Short mmCIF file of C-alpha atoms and ligand atoms in Angstrom, two decimals:
data_model
loop_
_atom_site.label_atom_id
_atom_site.label_comp_id
_atom_site.label_asym_id
_atom_site.label_seq_id
_atom_site.Cartn_x
_atom_site.Cartn_y
_atom_site.Cartn_z
CA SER A 1 -192.64 29.04 12.52
CA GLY A 2 -193.38 27.53 9.10
CA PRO A 3 -195.03 29.10 6.03
CA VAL A 4 -198.43 30.80 5.70
CA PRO A 5 -201.34 28.74 4.31
CA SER A 6 -202.72 29.19 0.78
CA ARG A 7 -206.03 28.37 -0.91
CA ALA A 8 -206.90 28.02 -4.58
CA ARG A 9 -209.16 30.90 -5.65
CA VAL A 10 -211.34 28.74 -7.95
CA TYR A 11 -212.78 25.22 -7.66
CA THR A 12 -211.49 25.17 -4.09
CA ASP A 13 -213.65 22.31 -2.72
CA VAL A 14 -214.82 20.36 -5.80
CA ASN A 15 -213.43 17.15 -4.25
CA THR A 16 -214.84 17.96 -0.79
CA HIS A 17 -218.38 18.25 -2.21
CA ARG A 18 -217.90 14.95 -4.07
CA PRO A 19 -218.10 11.40 -2.69
CA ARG A 20 -215.01 9.76 -1.18
CA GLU A 21 -214.64 7.31 -4.10
CA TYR A 22 -214.10 10.19 -6.57
CA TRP A 23 -210.71 11.36 -5.26
CA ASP A 24 -209.60 8.53 -2.93
CA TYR A 25 -207.57 6.67 -5.58
CA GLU A 26 -206.01 4.48 -2.86
CA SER A 27 -209.38 2.73 -2.34
CA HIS A 28 -210.12 2.18 -6.06
CA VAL A 29 -210.21 -1.37 -7.41
CA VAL A 30 -208.93 -1.46 -10.99
CA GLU A 31 -210.91 -3.96 -13.05
CA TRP A 32 -208.11 -4.90 -15.45
CA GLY A 33 -209.13 -5.64 -19.04
CA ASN A 34 -207.85 -8.30 -21.42
CA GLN A 35 -204.43 -7.73 -23.04
CA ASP A 36 -205.39 -10.03 -25.96
CA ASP A 37 -207.90 -7.43 -27.22
CA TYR A 38 -204.91 -5.30 -28.29
CA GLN A 39 -202.13 -6.08 -30.78
CA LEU A 40 -199.15 -3.74 -31.27
CA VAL A 41 -198.66 -2.26 -34.75
CA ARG A 42 -195.64 0.05 -34.49
CA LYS A 43 -193.60 2.08 -32.02
CA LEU A 44 -194.81 5.71 -31.94
CA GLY A 45 -191.96 6.42 -29.52
CA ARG A 46 -191.00 6.47 -25.85
CA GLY A 47 -191.83 9.42 -23.62
CA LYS A 48 -189.84 10.95 -20.75
CA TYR A 49 -191.38 8.19 -18.55
CA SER A 50 -193.04 5.50 -20.75
CA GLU A 51 -192.97 3.53 -24.03
CA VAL A 52 -195.81 4.08 -26.51
CA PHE A 53 -197.26 2.13 -29.40
CA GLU A 54 -199.77 2.24 -32.19
CA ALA A 55 -202.20 -0.62 -31.58
CA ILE A 56 -205.40 -2.20 -32.87
CA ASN A 57 -208.42 -3.36 -30.83
CA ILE A 58 -209.39 -6.75 -32.34
CA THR A 59 -212.83 -6.68 -30.65
CA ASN A 60 -213.96 -3.61 -32.67
CA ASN A 61 -211.21 -3.12 -35.33
CA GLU A 62 -210.55 0.46 -34.15
CA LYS A 63 -207.07 1.85 -33.53
CA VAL A 64 -205.81 2.69 -30.05
CA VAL A 65 -202.60 4.03 -28.54
CA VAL A 66 -201.01 1.83 -25.88
CA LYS A 67 -198.68 3.19 -23.20
CA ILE A 68 -196.76 0.51 -21.28
CA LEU A 69 -196.10 2.18 -17.94
CA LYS A 70 -192.66 2.82 -16.47
CA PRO A 71 -191.62 0.48 -13.62
CA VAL A 72 -193.49 2.56 -11.04
CA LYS A 73 -195.22 2.21 -7.67
CA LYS A 74 -198.82 0.98 -7.40
CA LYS A 75 -199.60 4.30 -5.67
CA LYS A 76 -198.83 6.22 -8.90
CA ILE A 77 -200.53 3.66 -11.16
CA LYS A 78 -203.90 4.01 -9.43
CA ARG A 79 -203.71 7.81 -9.15
CA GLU A 80 -203.29 8.25 -12.92
CA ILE A 81 -206.02 5.82 -13.99
CA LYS A 82 -208.50 7.25 -11.47
CA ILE A 83 -207.71 10.73 -12.78
CA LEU A 84 -208.17 9.61 -16.42
CA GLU A 85 -211.50 7.89 -15.71
CA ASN A 86 -212.79 11.08 -14.05
CA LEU A 87 -211.56 13.36 -16.86
CA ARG A 88 -213.16 11.13 -19.54
CA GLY A 89 -215.22 13.01 -22.15
CA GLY A 90 -213.69 16.36 -21.12
CA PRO A 91 -212.74 18.85 -23.81
CA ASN A 92 -209.26 18.21 -25.25
CA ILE A 93 -208.27 15.59 -22.67
CA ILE A 94 -207.09 12.21 -23.97
CA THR A 95 -209.64 9.54 -23.03
CA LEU A 96 -208.63 6.25 -21.42
CA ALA A 97 -210.09 3.39 -23.44
CA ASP A 98 -209.07 0.44 -21.29
CA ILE A 99 -206.32 -0.69 -18.92
CA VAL A 100 -204.62 -4.06 -19.35
CA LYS A 101 -201.74 -6.02 -17.85
CA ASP A 102 -198.99 -8.14 -19.41
CA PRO A 103 -199.52 -11.91 -18.91
CA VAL A 104 -196.01 -12.90 -17.73
CA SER A 105 -194.38 -9.55 -16.90
CA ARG A 106 -197.38 -8.16 -14.97
CA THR A 107 -196.44 -4.65 -16.16
CA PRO A 108 -199.48 -2.37 -16.66
CA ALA A 109 -200.39 -0.61 -19.90
CA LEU A 110 -202.80 2.29 -20.44
CA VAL A 111 -204.83 2.19 -23.66
CA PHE A 112 -206.07 5.44 -25.22
CA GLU A 113 -208.03 6.83 -28.15
CA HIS A 114 -205.84 7.35 -31.22
CA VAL A 115 -204.93 10.96 -32.01
CA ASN A 116 -201.66 11.75 -33.85
CA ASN A 117 -197.85 11.48 -33.73
CA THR A 118 -197.48 15.26 -33.87
CA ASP A 119 -196.76 16.92 -30.53
CA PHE A 120 -197.03 20.71 -30.19
CA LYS A 121 -193.23 21.24 -29.92
CA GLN A 122 -192.45 19.80 -33.38
CA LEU A 123 -195.36 21.82 -34.84
CA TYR A 124 -194.32 25.13 -33.17
CA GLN A 125 -191.81 26.08 -35.93
CA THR A 126 -194.52 26.89 -38.52
CA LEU A 127 -197.30 28.72 -36.61
CA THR A 128 -198.97 32.07 -37.33
CA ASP A 129 -199.98 34.58 -34.64
CA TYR A 130 -203.58 33.34 -34.83
CA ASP A 131 -202.43 29.69 -34.55
CA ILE A 132 -200.68 30.37 -31.23
CA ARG A 133 -203.91 31.94 -29.95
CA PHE A 134 -206.11 29.13 -31.25
CA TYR A 135 -204.03 26.30 -29.75
CA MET A 136 -203.41 28.11 -26.47
CA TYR A 137 -207.20 28.50 -26.08
CA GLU A 138 -207.74 24.76 -26.63
CA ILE A 139 -205.17 24.03 -23.88
CA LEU A 140 -207.12 26.34 -21.53
CA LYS A 141 -210.31 24.39 -22.30
CA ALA A 142 -208.49 21.25 -21.11
CA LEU A 143 -206.90 23.08 -18.16
CA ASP A 144 -210.19 24.63 -16.98
CA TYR A 145 -212.00 21.28 -17.25
CA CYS A 146 -209.37 19.38 -15.24
CA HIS A 147 -209.24 22.17 -12.63
CA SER A 148 -213.06 22.32 -12.51
CA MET A 149 -212.99 18.56 -11.88
CA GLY A 150 -210.41 19.05 -9.09
CA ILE A 151 -207.20 17.98 -10.83
CA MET A 152 -203.86 19.75 -11.41
CA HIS A 153 -201.89 18.41 -14.41
CA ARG A 154 -198.48 19.35 -12.94
CA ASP A 155 -196.56 18.64 -16.19
CA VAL A 156 -197.86 21.15 -18.76
CA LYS A 157 -195.31 21.54 -21.57
CA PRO A 158 -195.03 21.39 -25.42
CA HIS A 159 -194.23 17.65 -25.62
CA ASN A 160 -197.42 16.83 -23.63
CA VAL A 161 -199.77 18.59 -26.05
CA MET A 162 -200.69 16.50 -29.10
CA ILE A 163 -202.00 18.51 -32.06
CA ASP A 164 -203.44 17.60 -35.47
CA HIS A 165 -202.67 20.85 -37.34
CA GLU A 166 -205.05 20.15 -40.24
CA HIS A 167 -208.24 19.20 -38.37
CA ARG A 168 -207.76 21.93 -35.71
CA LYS A 169 -207.75 19.23 -32.99
CA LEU A 170 -205.76 19.18 -29.74
CA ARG A 171 -205.13 16.86 -26.76
CA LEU A 172 -203.34 17.17 -23.41
CA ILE A 173 -201.51 13.92 -22.62
CA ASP A 174 -199.48 12.28 -19.82
CA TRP A 175 -201.49 12.58 -16.60
CA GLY A 176 -199.07 10.39 -14.63
CA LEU A 177 -197.85 13.34 -12.55
CA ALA A 178 -201.30 14.88 -12.07
CA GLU A 179 -202.99 14.89 -8.66
CA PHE A 180 -206.28 15.78 -6.94
CA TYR A 181 -206.47 19.21 -5.28
CA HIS A 182 -207.37 19.20 -1.57
CA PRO A 183 -207.28 22.34 0.67
CA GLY A 184 -204.57 22.35 3.36
CA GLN A 185 -202.60 19.59 1.61
CA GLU A 186 -198.84 19.78 1.16
CA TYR A 187 -197.74 18.80 -2.34
CA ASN A 188 -194.39 17.49 -3.54
CA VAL A 189 -192.24 20.01 -5.48
CA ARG A 190 -190.69 17.30 -7.71
CA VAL A 191 -193.14 17.68 -10.58
CA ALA A 192 -192.97 19.10 -14.10
CA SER A 193 -189.83 19.92 -16.08
CA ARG A 194 -187.27 22.56 -15.05
CA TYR A 195 -188.25 25.16 -17.62
CA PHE A 196 -191.96 24.86 -16.77
CA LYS A 197 -191.66 24.62 -12.96
CA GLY A 198 -193.27 27.57 -11.21
CA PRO A 199 -191.51 29.74 -8.62
CA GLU A 200 -193.44 27.93 -5.84
CA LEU A 201 -191.69 24.65 -6.77
CA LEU A 202 -188.24 26.26 -7.06
CA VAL A 203 -188.66 28.00 -3.67
CA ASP A 204 -189.74 24.68 -2.06
CA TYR A 205 -193.29 25.90 -1.36
CA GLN A 206 -195.55 22.92 -0.78
CA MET A 207 -199.11 24.25 -0.48
CA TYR A 208 -199.55 25.13 -4.16
CA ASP A 209 -202.64 24.56 -6.37
CA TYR A 210 -204.13 24.74 -9.93
CA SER A 211 -202.27 28.00 -10.60
CA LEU A 212 -199.04 26.03 -11.14
CA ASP A 213 -200.32 24.92 -14.56
CA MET A 214 -200.93 28.55 -15.51
CA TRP A 215 -197.29 29.36 -14.88
CA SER A 216 -196.29 26.50 -17.19
CA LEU A 217 -198.69 27.69 -19.88
CA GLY A 218 -197.07 31.12 -19.75
CA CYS A 219 -193.66 29.52 -20.26
CA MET A 220 -194.93 27.91 -23.48
CA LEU A 221 -196.56 31.06 -24.85
CA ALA A 222 -193.50 33.18 -24.04
CA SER A 223 -191.31 30.72 -25.95
CA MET A 224 -193.91 30.59 -28.74
CA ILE A 225 -194.20 34.36 -29.35
CA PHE A 226 -190.53 35.28 -28.77
CA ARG A 227 -189.26 32.10 -30.48
CA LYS A 228 -186.87 31.34 -27.62
CA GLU A 229 -187.03 27.62 -26.77
CA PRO A 230 -187.36 27.51 -23.78
CA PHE A 231 -187.97 31.07 -22.61
CA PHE A 232 -186.47 30.45 -19.16
CA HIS A 233 -183.39 28.30 -19.81
CA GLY A 234 -182.08 27.22 -16.40
CA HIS A 235 -179.11 24.88 -16.08
CA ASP A 236 -180.03 23.68 -12.58
CA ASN A 237 -183.05 24.34 -10.31
CA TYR A 238 -181.22 27.26 -8.66
CA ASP A 239 -180.48 28.79 -12.07
CA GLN A 240 -184.06 28.49 -13.32
CA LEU A 241 -185.30 30.88 -10.61
CA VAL A 242 -182.29 33.12 -11.32
CA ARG A 243 -183.31 33.28 -15.02
CA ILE A 244 -186.90 34.10 -14.05
CA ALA A 245 -185.63 36.78 -11.68
CA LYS A 246 -183.74 38.36 -14.60
CA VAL A 247 -187.05 39.00 -16.40
CA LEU A 248 -189.69 39.57 -13.69
CA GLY A 249 -187.15 41.26 -11.39
CA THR A 250 -186.07 40.37 -7.86
CA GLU A 251 -188.35 42.93 -6.16
CA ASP A 252 -191.62 40.96 -6.52
CA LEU A 253 -189.75 37.68 -5.85
CA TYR A 254 -188.82 38.67 -2.28
CA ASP A 255 -192.34 40.05 -1.71
CA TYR A 256 -193.61 36.59 -2.74
CA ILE A 257 -191.11 35.00 -0.34
CA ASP A 258 -192.06 36.99 2.79
CA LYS A 259 -195.83 37.08 2.08
CA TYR A 260 -196.13 33.30 2.39
CA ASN A 261 -193.35 33.21 5.04
CA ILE A 262 -191.28 30.98 2.75
CA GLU A 263 -187.89 29.81 4.04
CA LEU A 264 -184.86 29.00 1.88
CA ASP A 265 -181.06 28.88 1.92
CA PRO A 266 -179.35 32.18 2.80
CA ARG A 267 -177.06 31.70 -0.21
CA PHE A 268 -180.10 31.49 -2.51
CA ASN A 269 -180.83 35.14 -1.63
CA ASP A 270 -177.15 35.89 -2.34
CA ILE A 271 -177.20 33.84 -5.56
CA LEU A 272 -180.35 35.57 -6.80
CA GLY A 273 -179.20 38.91 -5.41
CA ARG A 274 -180.76 42.08 -6.81
CA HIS A 275 -181.79 42.50 -10.45
CA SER A 276 -184.14 44.93 -12.20
CA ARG A 277 -187.33 43.99 -14.02
CA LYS A 278 -187.39 43.77 -17.83
CA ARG A 279 -190.50 44.86 -19.76
CA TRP A 280 -191.92 42.14 -22.04
CA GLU A 281 -191.22 44.20 -25.20
CA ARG A 282 -187.44 43.81 -24.72
CA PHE A 283 -187.57 40.13 -25.82
CA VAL A 284 -188.94 41.28 -29.19
CA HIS A 285 -186.56 42.46 -31.94
CA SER A 286 -186.09 40.83 -35.37
CA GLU A 287 -188.13 37.89 -36.77
CA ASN A 288 -190.90 37.80 -34.14
CA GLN A 289 -192.55 41.26 -34.15
CA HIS A 290 -195.47 39.79 -36.13
CA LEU A 291 -196.18 37.30 -33.29
CA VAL A 292 -196.18 39.83 -30.42
CA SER A 293 -199.18 42.13 -29.95
CA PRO A 294 -200.13 44.30 -26.95
CA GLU A 295 -202.85 41.82 -25.86
CA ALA A 296 -200.29 38.99 -26.01
CA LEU A 297 -197.92 40.88 -23.71
CA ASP A 298 -200.63 41.73 -21.16
CA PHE A 299 -201.89 38.14 -21.19
CA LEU A 300 -198.34 36.86 -20.73
CA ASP A 301 -197.71 39.41 -17.96
CA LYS A 302 -200.81 38.16 -16.10
CA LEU A 303 -199.81 34.46 -16.32
CA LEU A 304 -196.15 34.83 -15.35
CA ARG A 305 -196.61 36.11 -11.80
CA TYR A 306 -194.42 34.95 -8.91
CA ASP A 307 -197.49 34.99 -6.70
CA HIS A 308 -199.43 31.87 -7.71
CA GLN A 309 -202.68 33.28 -6.23
CA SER A 310 -202.49 36.40 -8.45
CA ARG A 311 -202.07 34.46 -11.73
CA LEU A 312 -205.05 34.29 -14.09
CA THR A 313 -207.26 31.21 -13.77
CA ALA A 314 -207.93 29.21 -16.94
CA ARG A 315 -211.40 30.75 -17.28
CA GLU A 316 -210.00 34.24 -16.65
CA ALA A 317 -207.36 33.55 -19.31
CA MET A 318 -210.09 32.42 -21.73
CA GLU A 319 -211.75 35.87 -21.26
CA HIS A 320 -208.56 37.82 -22.09
CA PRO A 321 -208.60 40.05 -25.23
CA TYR A 322 -205.87 37.80 -26.73
CA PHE A 323 -208.63 35.30 -27.65
CA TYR A 324 -211.39 37.82 -28.44
CA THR A 325 -211.52 36.88 -32.13
CA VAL A 326 -210.77 33.21 -31.31
CA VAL A 327 -213.94 32.75 -29.21
CA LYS A 328 -215.89 34.71 -31.85
CA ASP A 329 -214.37 32.63 -34.66
CA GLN A 330 -215.38 29.30 -33.08
CA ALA A 331 -218.98 30.55 -32.68
CA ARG A 332 -219.49 30.13 -36.47
CA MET A 333 -217.53 26.86 -37.01
CA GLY A 334 -216.17 25.37 -33.76
O1 4B0 B 401 -191.07 10.04 -27.70
C1 4B0 B 401 -192.29 9.98 -28.45
C2 4B0 B 401 -193.48 9.63 -27.54
C3 4B0 B 401 -194.78 10.31 -28.02
N1 4B0 B 401 -195.87 10.11 -27.04
N2 4B0 B 401 -195.69 10.11 -25.82
N3 4B0 B 401 -196.74 9.92 -25.20
C4 4B0 B 401 -197.74 9.78 -26.06
C5 4B0 B 401 -199.10 9.56 -25.92
BR1 4B0 B 401 -199.86 9.40 -24.20
C6 4B0 B 401 -199.90 9.46 -27.05
BR2 4B0 B 401 -201.76 9.15 -26.80
C7 4B0 B 401 -199.34 9.58 -28.32
BR3 4B0 B 401 -200.48 9.43 -29.84
C8 4B0 B 401 -197.96 9.81 -28.46
BR4 4B0 B 401 -197.18 9.97 -30.19
C9 4B0 B 401 -197.16 9.91 -27.32
CL1 CL B 402 -197.89 15.40 -4.48
CL1 CL B 403 -208.18 27.39 -13.18
#
């Protein structure tokens, strides 16, 4: 029988209208730069799947950030670089500077523009109501650009947003899980991090799209405004959906399941069972009332939908009242 097909509502064929060499990363020939150009200064850390350094380009004396890639397949290597080259110059997307290779090891290393140590998770414990709005909007600028260029990020979370609090700057990093969106294509559910995985991924639905990132963004905001890190705290993949069910309710979950003719374990239905919906105001109480407004709760409600097709698009989200003053504020400064 199988499931019902799905299409992205926006940017549906941006790769179809483009030439083959745009999205066919398997046919790309990576002209590898010279490793000697770059000298490592200090270890900025090591991410969930890489090791990252502060570095200096000796050809122009500018600073760069080098990311020595995890022992990974050549299929993933080429996908990421091709996605970064295409997203270059986009608003709030980190820009690939060069790509080099170790002389003896032959392990690849992405080189980027220098931004800042400070990720958005470490900076989240000192943010006003207007700061949440401002930095969420900047993430939507990056999310609408990458969607508009035909790319899902697939790993949107606090750690992958770099933010310079003082200069009002923001970058979305780690595109190594991202992928090009093509209609009719089945996509692998093993992307993102538990707490930010959409219901589509947890119900083993393959034909998802850009809307996945909008789920993840909701997860951040929810945690940001209610100060519950993370807002949906699953222990395993089964439990994550069970936590989500305990907020959005099980009624719309099973409507989502039949609509797309999605199949899953009988015991999942038993595990989930029946549970009532909880209105978004019930996660407010003590030291967070200042962060939660009506426009925040509507916005959040419209992002955290089981049905991926119903979720707000990045552009739609940018038009929400939540940002009304934000878009007006940046029209007299930027
Ligand atoms: O565990 C700490 C790792 C932090 N980390 N991970 N990926 C990073 C990227 Br890409 C850039 Br660019 C920058 Br600047 C930093 Br800092 C990064
Ligand atoms: Cl995939
Ligand atoms: Cl979108």
